[PDB]
PDB file of C-alpha atoms in Angstrom:
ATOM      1  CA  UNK G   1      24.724 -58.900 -15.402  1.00 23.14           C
ATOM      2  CA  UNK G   2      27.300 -56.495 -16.969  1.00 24.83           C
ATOM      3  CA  UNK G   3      25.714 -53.624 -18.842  1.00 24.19           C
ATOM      4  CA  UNK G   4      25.973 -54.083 -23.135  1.00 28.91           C
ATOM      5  CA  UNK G   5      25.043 -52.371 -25.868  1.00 28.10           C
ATOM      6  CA  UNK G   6      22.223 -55.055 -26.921  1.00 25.62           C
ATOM      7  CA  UNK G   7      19.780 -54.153 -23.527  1.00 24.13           C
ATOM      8  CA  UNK G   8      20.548 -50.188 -24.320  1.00 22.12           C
ATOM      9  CA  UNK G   9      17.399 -48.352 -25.505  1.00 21.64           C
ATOM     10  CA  UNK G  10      18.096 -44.558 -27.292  1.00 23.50           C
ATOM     11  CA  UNK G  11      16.061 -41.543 -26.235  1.00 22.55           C
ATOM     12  CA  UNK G  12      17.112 -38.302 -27.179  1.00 22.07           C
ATOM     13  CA  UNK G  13      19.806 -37.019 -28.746  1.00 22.27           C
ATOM     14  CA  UNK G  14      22.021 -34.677 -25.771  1.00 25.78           C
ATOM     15  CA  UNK G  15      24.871 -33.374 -27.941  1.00 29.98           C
ATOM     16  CA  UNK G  16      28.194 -34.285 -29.360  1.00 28.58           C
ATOM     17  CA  UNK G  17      32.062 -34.556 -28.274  1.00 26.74           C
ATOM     18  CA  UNK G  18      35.039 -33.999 -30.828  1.00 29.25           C
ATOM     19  CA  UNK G  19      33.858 -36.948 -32.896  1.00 32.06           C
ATOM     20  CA  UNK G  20      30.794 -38.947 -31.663  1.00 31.80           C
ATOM     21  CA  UNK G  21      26.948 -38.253 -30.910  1.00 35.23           C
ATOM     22  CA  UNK G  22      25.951 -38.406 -27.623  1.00 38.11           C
ATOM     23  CA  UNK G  23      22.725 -39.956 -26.484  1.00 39.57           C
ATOM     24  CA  UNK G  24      20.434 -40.484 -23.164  1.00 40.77           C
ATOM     25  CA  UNK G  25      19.969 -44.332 -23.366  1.00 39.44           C
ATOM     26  CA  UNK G  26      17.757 -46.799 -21.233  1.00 39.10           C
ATOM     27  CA  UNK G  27      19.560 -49.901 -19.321  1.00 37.65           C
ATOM     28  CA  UNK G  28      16.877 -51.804 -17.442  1.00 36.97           C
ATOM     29  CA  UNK G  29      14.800 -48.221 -16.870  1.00 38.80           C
ATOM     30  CA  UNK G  30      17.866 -46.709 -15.707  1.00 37.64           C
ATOM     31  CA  UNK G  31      19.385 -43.301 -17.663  1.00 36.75           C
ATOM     32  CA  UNK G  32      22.670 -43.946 -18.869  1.00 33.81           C
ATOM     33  CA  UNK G  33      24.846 -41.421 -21.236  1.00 35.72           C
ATOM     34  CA  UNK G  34      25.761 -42.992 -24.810  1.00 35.14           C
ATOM     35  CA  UNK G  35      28.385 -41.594 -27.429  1.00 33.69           C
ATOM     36  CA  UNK G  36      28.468 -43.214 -30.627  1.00 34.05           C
ATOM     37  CA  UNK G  37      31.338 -43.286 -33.370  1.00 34.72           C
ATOM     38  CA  UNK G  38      30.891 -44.518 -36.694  1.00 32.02           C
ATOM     39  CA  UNK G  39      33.335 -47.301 -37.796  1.00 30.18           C
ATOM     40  CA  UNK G  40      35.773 -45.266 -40.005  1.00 28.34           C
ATOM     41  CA  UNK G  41      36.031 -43.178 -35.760  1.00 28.12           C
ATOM     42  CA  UNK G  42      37.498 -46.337 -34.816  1.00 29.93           C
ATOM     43  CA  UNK G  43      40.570 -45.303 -33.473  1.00 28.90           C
ATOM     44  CA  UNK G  44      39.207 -42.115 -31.395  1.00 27.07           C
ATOM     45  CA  UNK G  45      36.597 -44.072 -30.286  1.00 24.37           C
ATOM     46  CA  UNK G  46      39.466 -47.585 -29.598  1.00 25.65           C
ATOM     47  CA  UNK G  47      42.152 -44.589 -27.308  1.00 25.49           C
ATOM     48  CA  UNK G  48      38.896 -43.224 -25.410  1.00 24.15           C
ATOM     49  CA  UNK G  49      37.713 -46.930 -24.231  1.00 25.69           C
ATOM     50  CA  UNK G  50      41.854 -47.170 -23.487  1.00 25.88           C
ATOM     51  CA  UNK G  51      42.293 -44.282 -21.240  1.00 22.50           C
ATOM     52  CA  UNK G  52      38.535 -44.780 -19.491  1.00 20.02           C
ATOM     53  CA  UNK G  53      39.817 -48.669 -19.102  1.00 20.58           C
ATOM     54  CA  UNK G  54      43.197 -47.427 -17.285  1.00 18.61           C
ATOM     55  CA  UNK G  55      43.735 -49.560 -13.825  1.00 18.25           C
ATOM     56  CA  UNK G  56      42.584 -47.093 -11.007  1.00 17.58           C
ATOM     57  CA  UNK G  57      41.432 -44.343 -12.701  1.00 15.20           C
ATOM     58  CA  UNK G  58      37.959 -44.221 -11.048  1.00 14.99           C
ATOM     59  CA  UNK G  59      37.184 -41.554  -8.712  1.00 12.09           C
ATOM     60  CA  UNK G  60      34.310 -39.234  -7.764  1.00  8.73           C
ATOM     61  CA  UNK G  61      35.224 -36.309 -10.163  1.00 10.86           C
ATOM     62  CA  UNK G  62      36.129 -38.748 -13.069  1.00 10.99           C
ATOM     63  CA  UNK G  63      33.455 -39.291 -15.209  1.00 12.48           C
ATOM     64  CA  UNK G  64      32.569 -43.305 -14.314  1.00 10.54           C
ATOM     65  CA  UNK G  65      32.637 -45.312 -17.442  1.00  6.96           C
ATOM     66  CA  UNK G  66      30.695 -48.181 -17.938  1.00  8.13           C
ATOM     67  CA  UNK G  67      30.950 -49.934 -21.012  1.00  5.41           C
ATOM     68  CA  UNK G  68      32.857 -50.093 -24.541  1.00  3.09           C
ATOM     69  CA  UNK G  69      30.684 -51.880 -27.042  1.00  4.90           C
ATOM     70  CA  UNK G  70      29.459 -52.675 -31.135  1.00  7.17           C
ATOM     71  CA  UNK G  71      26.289 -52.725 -32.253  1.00  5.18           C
ATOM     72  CA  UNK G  72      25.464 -54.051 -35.542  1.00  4.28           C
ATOM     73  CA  UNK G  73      21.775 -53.398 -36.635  1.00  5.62           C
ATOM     74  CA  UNK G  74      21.513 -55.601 -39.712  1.00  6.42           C
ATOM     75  CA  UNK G  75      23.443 -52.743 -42.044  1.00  7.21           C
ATOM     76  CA  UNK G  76      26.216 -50.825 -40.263  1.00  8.75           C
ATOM     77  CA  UNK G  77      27.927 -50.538 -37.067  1.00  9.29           C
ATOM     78  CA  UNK G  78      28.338 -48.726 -34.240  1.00  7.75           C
ATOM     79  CA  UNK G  79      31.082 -48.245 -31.686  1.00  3.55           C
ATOM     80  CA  UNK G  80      29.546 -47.400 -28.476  1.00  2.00           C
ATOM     81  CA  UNK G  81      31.203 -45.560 -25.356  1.00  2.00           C
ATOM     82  CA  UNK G  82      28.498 -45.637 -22.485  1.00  2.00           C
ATOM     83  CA  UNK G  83      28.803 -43.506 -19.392  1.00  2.67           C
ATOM     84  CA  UNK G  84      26.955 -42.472 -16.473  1.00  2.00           C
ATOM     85  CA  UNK G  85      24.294 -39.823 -17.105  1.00  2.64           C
ATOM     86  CA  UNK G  86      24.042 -36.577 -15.252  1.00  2.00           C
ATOM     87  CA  UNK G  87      20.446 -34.648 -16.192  1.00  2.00           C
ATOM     88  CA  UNK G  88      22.632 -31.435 -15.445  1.00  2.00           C
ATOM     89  CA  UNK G  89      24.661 -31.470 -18.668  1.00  2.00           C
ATOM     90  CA  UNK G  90      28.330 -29.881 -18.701  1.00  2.00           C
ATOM     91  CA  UNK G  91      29.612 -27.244 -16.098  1.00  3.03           C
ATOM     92  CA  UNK G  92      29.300 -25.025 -19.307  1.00  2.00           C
ATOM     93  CA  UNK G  93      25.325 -25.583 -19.217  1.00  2.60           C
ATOM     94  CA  UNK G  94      25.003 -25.442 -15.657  1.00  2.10           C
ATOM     95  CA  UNK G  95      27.007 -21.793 -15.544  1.00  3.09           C
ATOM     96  CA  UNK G  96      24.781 -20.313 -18.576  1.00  2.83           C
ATOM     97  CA  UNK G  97      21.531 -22.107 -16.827  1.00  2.00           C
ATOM     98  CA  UNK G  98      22.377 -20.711 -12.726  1.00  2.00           C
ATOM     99  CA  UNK G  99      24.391 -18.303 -10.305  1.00  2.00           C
ATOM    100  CA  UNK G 100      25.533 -20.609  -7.570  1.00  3.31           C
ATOM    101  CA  UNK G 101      26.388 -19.374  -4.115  1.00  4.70           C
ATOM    102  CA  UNK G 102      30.029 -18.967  -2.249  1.00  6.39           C
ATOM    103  CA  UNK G 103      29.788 -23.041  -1.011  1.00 10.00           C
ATOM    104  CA  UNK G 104      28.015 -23.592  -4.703  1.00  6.13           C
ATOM    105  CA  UNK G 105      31.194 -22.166  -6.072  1.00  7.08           C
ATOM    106  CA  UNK G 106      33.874 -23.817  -3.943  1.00  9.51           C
ATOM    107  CA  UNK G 107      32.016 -27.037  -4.308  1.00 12.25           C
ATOM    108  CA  UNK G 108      32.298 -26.786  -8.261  1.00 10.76           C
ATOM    109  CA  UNK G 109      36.398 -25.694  -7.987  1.00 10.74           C
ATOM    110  CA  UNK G 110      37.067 -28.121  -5.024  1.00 12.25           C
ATOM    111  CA  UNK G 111      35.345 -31.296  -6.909  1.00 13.28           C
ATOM    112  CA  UNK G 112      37.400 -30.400 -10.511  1.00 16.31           C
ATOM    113  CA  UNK G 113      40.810 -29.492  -8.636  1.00 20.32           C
ATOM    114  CA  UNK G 114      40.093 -33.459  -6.625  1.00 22.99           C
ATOM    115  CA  UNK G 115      39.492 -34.893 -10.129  1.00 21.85           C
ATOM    116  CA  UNK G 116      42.378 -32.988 -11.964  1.00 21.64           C
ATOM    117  CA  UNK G 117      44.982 -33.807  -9.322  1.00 20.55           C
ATOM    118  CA  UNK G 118      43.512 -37.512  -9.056  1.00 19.79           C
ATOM    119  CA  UNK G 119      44.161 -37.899 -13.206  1.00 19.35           C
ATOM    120  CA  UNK G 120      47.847 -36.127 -12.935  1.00 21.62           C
ATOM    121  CA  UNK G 121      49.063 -38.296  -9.762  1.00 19.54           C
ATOM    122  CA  UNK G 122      50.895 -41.758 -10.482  1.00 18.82           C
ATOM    123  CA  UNK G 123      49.630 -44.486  -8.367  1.00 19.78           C
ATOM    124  CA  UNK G 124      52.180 -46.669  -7.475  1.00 21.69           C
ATOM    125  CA  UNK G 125      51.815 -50.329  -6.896  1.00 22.58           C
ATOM    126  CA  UNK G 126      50.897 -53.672  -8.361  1.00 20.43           C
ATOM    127  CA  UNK G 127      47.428 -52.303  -9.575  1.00 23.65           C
ATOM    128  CA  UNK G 128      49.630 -49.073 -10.329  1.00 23.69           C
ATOM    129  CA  UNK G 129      47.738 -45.966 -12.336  1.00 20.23           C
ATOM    130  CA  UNK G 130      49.579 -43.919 -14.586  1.00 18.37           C
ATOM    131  CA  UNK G 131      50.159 -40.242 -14.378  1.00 16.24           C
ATOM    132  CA  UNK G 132      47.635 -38.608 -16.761  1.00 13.08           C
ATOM    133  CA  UNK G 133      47.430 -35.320 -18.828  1.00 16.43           C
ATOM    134  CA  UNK G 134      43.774 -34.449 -19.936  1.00 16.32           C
ATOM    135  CA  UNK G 135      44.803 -32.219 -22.945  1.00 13.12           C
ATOM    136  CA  UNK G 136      41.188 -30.479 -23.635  1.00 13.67           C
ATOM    137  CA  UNK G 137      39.888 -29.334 -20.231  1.00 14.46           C
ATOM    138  CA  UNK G 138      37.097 -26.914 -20.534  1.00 17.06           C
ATOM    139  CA  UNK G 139      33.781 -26.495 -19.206  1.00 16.75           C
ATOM    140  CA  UNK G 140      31.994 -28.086 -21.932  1.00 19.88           C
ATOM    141  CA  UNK G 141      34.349 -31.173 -20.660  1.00 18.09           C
ATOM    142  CA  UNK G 142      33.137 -31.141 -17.192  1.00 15.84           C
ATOM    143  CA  UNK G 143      29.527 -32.461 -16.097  1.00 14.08           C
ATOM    144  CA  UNK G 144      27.884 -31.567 -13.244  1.00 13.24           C
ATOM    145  CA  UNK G 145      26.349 -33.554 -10.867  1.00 15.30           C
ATOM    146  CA  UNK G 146      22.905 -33.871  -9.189  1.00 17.09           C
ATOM    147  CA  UNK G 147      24.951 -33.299  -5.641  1.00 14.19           C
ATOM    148  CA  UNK G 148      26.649 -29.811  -7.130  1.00  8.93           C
ATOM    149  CA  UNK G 149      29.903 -31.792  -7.402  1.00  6.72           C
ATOM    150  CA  UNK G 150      32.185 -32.086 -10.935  1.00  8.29           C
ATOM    151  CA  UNK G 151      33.446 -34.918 -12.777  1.00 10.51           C
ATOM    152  CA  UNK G 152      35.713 -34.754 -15.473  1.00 12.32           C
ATOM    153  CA  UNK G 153      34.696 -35.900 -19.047  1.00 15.12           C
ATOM    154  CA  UNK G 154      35.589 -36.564 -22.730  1.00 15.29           C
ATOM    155  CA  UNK G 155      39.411 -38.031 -21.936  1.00 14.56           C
ATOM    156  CA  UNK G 156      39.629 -39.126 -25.671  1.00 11.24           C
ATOM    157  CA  UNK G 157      42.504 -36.697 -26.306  1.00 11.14           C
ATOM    158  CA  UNK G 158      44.339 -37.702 -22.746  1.00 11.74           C
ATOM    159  CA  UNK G 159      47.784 -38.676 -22.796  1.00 14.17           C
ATOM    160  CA  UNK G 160      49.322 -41.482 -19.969  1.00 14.00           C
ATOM    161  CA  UNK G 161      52.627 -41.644 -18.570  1.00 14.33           C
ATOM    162  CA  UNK G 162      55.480 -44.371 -17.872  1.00 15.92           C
ATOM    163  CA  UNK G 163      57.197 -42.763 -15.121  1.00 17.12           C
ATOM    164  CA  UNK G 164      60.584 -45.331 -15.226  1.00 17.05           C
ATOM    165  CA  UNK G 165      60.929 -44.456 -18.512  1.00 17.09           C
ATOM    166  CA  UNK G 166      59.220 -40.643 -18.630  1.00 14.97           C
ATOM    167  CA  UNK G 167      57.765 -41.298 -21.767  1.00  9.65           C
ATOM    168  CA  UNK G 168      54.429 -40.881 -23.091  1.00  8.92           C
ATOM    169  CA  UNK G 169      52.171 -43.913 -24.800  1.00  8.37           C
ATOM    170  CA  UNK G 170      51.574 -42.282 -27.865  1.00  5.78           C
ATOM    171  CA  UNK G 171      53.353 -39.927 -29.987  1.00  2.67           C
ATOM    172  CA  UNK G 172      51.034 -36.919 -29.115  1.00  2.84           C
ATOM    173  CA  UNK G 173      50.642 -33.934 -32.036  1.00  6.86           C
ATOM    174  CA  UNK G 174      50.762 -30.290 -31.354  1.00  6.38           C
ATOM    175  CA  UNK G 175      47.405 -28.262 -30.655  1.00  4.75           C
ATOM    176  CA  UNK G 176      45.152 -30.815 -30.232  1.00  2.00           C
ATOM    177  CA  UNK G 177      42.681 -29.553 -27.831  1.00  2.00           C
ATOM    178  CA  UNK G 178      39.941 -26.679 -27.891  1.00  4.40           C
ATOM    179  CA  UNK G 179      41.647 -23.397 -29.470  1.00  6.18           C
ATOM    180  CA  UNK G 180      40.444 -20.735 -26.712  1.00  3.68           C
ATOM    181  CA  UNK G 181      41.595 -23.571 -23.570  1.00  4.80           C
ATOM    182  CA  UNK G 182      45.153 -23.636 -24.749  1.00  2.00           C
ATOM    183  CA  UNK G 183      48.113 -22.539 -23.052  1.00  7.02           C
ATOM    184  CA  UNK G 184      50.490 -19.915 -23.854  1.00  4.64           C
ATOM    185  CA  UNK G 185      53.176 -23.064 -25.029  1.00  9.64           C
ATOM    186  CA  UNK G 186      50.518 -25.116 -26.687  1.00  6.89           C
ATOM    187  CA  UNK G 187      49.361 -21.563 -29.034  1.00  5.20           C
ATOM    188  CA  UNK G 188      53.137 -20.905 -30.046  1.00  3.79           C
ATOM    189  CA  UNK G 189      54.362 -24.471 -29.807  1.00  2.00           C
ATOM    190  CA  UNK G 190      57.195 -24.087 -27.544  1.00  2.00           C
ATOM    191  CA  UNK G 191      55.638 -26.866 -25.488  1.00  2.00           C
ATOM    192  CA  UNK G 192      58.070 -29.809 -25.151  1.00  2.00           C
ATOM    193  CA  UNK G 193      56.086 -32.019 -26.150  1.00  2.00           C
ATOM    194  CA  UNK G 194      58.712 -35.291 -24.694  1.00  2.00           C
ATOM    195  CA  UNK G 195      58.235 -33.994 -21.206  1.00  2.00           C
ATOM    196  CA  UNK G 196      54.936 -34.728 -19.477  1.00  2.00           C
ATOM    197  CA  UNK G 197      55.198 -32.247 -17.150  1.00  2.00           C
ATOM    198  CA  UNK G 198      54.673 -29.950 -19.779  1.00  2.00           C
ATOM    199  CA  UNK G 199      50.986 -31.475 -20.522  1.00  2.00           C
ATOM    200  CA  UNK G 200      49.723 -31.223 -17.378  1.00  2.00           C
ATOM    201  CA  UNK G 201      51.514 -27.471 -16.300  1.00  2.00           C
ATOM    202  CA  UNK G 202      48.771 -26.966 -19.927  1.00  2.00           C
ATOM    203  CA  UNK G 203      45.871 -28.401 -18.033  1.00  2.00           C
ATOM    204  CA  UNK G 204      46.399 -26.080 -15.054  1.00  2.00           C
ATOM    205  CA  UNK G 205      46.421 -22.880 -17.403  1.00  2.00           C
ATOM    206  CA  UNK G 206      43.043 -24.417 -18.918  1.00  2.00           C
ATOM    207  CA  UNK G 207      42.111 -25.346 -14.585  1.00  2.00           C
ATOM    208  CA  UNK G 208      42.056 -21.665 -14.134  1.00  2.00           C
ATOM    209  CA  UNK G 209      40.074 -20.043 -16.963  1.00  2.00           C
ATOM    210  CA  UNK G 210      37.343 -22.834 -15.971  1.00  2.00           C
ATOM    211  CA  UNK G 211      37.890 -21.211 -12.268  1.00  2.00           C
ATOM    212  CA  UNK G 212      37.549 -17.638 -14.186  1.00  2.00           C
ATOM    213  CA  UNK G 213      33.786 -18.822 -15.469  1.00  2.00           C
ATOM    214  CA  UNK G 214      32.500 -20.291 -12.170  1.00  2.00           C
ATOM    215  CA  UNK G 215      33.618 -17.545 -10.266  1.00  2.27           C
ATOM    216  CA  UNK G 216      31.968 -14.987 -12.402  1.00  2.00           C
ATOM    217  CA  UNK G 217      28.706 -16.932 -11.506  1.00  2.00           C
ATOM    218  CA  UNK G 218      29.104 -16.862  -7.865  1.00  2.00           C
ATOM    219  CA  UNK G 219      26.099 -14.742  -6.578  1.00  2.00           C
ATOM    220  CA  UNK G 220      26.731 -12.505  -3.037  1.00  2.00           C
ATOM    221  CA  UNK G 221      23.752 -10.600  -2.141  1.00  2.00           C
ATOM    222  CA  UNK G 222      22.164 -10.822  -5.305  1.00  2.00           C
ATOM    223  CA  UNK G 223      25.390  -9.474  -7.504  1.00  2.55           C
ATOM    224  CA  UNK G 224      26.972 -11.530  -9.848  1.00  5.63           C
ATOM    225  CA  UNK G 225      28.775 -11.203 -13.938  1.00  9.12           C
ATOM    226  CA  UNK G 226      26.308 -12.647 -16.537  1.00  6.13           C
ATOM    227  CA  UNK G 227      27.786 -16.065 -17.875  1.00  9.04           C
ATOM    228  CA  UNK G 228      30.762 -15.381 -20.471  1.00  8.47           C
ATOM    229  CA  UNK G 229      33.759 -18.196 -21.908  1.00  6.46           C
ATOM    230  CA  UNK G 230      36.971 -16.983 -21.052  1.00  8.01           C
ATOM    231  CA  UNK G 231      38.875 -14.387 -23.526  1.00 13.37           C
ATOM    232  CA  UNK G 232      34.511 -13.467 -24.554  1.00 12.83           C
ATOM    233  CA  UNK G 233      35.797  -9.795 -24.880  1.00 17.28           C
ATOM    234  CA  UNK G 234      38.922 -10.535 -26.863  1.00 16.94           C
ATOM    235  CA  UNK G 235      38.595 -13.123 -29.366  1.00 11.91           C
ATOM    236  CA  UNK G 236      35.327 -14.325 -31.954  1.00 12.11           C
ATOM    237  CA  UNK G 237      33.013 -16.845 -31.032  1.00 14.99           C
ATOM    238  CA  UNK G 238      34.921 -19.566 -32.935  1.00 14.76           C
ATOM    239  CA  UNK G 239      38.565 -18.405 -32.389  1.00 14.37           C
ATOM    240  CA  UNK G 240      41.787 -19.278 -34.710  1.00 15.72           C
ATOM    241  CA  UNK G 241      45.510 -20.492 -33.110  1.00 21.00           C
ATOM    242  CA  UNK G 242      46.825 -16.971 -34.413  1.00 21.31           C
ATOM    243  CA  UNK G 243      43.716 -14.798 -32.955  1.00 23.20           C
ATOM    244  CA  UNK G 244      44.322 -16.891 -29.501  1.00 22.82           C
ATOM    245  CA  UNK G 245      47.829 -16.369 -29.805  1.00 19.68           C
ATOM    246  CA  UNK G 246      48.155 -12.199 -30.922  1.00 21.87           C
ATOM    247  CA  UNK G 247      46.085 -12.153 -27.146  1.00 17.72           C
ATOM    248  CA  UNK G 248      47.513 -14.826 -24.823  1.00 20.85           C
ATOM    249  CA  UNK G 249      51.306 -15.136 -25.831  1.00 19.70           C
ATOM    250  CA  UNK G 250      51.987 -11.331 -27.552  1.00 19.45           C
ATOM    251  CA  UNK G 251      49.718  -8.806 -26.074  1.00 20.52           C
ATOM    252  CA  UNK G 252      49.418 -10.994 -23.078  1.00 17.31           C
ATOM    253  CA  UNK G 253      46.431 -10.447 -21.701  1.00 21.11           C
ATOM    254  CA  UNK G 254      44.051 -13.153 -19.471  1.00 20.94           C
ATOM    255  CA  UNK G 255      40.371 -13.079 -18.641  1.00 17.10           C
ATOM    256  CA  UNK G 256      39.575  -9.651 -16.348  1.00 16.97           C
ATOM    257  CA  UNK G 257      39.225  -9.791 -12.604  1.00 16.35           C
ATOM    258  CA  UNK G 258      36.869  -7.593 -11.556  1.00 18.32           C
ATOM    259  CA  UNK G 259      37.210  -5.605  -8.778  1.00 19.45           C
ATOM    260  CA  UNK G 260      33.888  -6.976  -7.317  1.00 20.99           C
ATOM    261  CA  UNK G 261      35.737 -10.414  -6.192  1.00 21.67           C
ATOM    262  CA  UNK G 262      38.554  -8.537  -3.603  1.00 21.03           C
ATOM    263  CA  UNK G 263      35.452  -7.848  -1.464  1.00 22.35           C
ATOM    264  CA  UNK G 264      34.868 -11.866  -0.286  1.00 23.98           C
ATOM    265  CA  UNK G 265      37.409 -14.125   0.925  1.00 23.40           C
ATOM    266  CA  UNK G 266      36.646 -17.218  -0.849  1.00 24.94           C
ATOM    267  CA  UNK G 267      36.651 -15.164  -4.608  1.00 31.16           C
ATOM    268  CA  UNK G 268      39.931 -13.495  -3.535  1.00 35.08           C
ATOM    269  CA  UNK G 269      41.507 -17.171  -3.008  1.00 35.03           C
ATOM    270  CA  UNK G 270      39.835 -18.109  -6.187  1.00 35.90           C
ATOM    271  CA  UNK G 271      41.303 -15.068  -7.953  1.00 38.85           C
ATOM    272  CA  UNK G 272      44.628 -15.957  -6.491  1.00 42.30           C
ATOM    273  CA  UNK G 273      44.476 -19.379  -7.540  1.00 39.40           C
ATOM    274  CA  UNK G 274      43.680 -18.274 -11.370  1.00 40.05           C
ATOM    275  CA  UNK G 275      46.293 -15.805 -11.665  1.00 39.10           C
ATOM    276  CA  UNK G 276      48.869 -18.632 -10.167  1.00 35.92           C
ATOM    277  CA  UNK G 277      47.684 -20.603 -13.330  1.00 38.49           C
ATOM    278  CA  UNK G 278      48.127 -17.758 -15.629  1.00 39.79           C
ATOM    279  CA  UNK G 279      51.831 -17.509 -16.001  1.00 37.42           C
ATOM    280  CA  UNK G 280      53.365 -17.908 -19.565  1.00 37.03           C
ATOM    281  CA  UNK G 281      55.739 -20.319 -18.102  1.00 36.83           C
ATOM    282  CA  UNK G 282      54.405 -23.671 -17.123  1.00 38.98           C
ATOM    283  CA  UNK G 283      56.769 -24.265 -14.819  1.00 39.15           C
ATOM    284  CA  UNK G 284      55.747 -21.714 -12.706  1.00 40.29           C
ATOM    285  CA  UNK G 285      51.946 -22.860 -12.062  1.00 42.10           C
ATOM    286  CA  UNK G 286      50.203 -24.043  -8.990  1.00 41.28           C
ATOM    287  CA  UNK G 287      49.768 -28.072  -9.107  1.00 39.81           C
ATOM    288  CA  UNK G 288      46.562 -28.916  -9.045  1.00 40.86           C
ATOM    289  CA  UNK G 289      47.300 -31.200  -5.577  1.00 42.84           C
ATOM    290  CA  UNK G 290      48.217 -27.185  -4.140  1.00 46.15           C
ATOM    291  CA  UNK G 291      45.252 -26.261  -5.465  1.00 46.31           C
ATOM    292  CA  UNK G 292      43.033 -28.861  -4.134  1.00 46.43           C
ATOM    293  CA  UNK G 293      44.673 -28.524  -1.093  1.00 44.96           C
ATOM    294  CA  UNK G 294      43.922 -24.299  -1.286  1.00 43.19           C
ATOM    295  CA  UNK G 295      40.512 -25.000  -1.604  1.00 41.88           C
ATOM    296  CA  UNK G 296      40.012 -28.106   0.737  1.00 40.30           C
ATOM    297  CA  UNK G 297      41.455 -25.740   3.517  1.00 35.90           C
ATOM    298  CA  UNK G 298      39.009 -22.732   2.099  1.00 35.31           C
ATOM    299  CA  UNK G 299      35.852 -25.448   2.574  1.00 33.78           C
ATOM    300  CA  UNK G 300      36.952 -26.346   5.801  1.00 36.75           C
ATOM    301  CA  UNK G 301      36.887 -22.476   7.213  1.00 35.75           C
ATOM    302  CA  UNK G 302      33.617 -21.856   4.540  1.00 31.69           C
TER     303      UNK G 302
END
C-alpha cells in the first residue's frame, strides 16, 4: 500500500535541485514530484531522505515527503527522493508567471513565515523534533500551492539541532547555500558556525529578500514592480561570494523599497518586516515565530 519506486511511471522532466533531476511521475494515476541522484550523489541524496525522515517535521508549509527509494533498471541505479507535486512550480515561477493581490501576498508571506518558524522550533517530547536551520532558502526553494499557500522545499543542505548538547549533527562547511541568499556573516564568514542560532538568524536574512520579491508583485489598483531576484540591480545574473559581498557586507546596501509600498498598510508591515531581517548582525533579526505572528495578526485585520 506504501508508495515505491517500482509502481512510479516518469513524464516530463520539471527541472533540477543542487544535485538531482526532478521529474513529474505517475503513482496509480496520481502526479507525484520525483528527484533522482545518480549513485556516486549518494550521500546528498542519503542527508536529504535524513532530514525529510526527521520525527515531526510534517506540516502544511513543509514540503510532504513521501518516499526514499532505488531503482535498478537492468544497468545502473537510481536513488529516488519522491515528493508531492504542485502543477504551480516554485514561488520563483509563480512571481515571474502572476501579480497576486494584498490577501494573495499575505497568504504567500504568512504560509513561508508558518513553515520557517515550524522547521526552527524544537519540539519537545518523546516523539521530540529537532530545531532545524534550512541553509538555502530562496524562492526557487519554495513551491506554491494550488490553494495560494507555500511549502518549503529542497532541505538537502538543512542542518538539525541537539538542544542538551547545542550541537549540530554534522560538521556543516562555510557558504554552502545559493550565493545571492546569503547573509552578511555567511559572505564574510564571521558566522559561528558552532552556534545554531547563527544558522537560522541566516535563514531570516534570506526570509526577507523572499518577502522583498513577493511584495514587489503585489498588485493595488492595477500598479505593481515587474518580477526581479533580490540585489537584480546590483550584482550579475550568476553572482560570485566577493561581488555579493563588495554590496551586502562593504557598501551595504539591500534590495530598494520603493516608495509605492508606504501607501498600503499590509506592504508597509511587509516592508517593516524585511528591513527587521536586514541587519548585518544576526542577532538583531525578527524570529520568524514574531514574524508569523506579525502577519497572522495582519490576516486577521486583512
Amino acid at each position: 500500500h506504501m508508495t515505491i519506486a517500482r509502481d512510479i511511471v516518469l513524464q516530463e522532466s520539471i527541472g533540477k535541485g543542487r544535485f538531482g533531476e526532478v521529474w513529474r511521475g505517475k503513482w496509480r494515476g496520481e502526479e507525484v514530484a520525483v528527484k533522482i541522484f545518480s549513485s556516486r550523489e549518494e550521500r546528498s541524496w542519503f542527508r536529504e531522505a535524513e532530514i525529510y525522515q526527521t520525527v515531526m517535521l510534517r506540516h502544511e508549509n513543509i514540503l510532504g515527503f513521501i518516499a526514499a527509494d532505488n531503482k535498478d533498471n537492468g544497468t545502473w541505479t537510481q536513488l529516488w527522493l519522491v515528493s508531492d507535486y504542485h502543477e504551480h512550480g516554485s514561488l520563483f515561477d509563480y512571481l515571474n508567471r502572476y501579480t497576486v493581490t494584498v490577501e494573495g501576498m499575505i497568504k504567500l508571506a504568512l504560509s513561508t513565515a508558518s513553515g520557517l518558524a515550524h522547521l526552527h522550533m524544537e519540539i519537545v517530547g518523546t516523539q521530540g523534533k529537532p530545531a532545524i536551520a534550512h541553509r538555502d532558502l530562496k524562492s526557487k526553494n519554495i513551491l506554491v500551492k494550488k490553494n495560494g499557500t507555500c511549502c518549503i522545499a529542497d532541505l538537502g543542505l538543512a542542518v538539525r539541532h541537539d538542544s542538551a548538547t547545542d550541537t549540530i549533527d554534522i560538521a556543516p562547511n562555510h557558504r554552502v547555500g545559493t550565493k545571492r541568499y546569503m547573509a552578511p556573516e555567511v559572505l564574510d564568514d564571521s558566522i559561528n558556525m558552532k552556534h545554531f542560532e547563527s544558522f537560522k538568524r541566516a535563514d531570516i536574512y534570506a526570509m526577507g529578500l523572499v518577502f522583498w520579491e513577493i511584495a514587489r508583485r503585489c498588485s493595488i489598483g492595477g500598479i505593481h514592480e515587474d518580477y526581479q531576484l533580490p540585489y537584480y540591480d546590483l550584482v550579475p545574473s550568476d553572482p560570485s561570494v566577493e561581488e555579493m559581498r563588495k554590496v551586502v557586507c562593504e557598501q551595504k546596501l539591500r534590495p530598494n523599497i520603493p516608495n509605492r509600498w508606504q501607501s498600503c498598510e499590509a506592504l508597509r508591515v511587509m516592508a517593516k518586516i524585511m528591513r527587521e531581517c536586514w541587519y548585518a548582525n544576526g542577532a538583531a533579526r525578527l524570529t520568524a515565530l514574531r514574524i508569523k505572528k506579525t502577519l497572522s495578526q495582519l490576516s486577521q485585520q486583512e
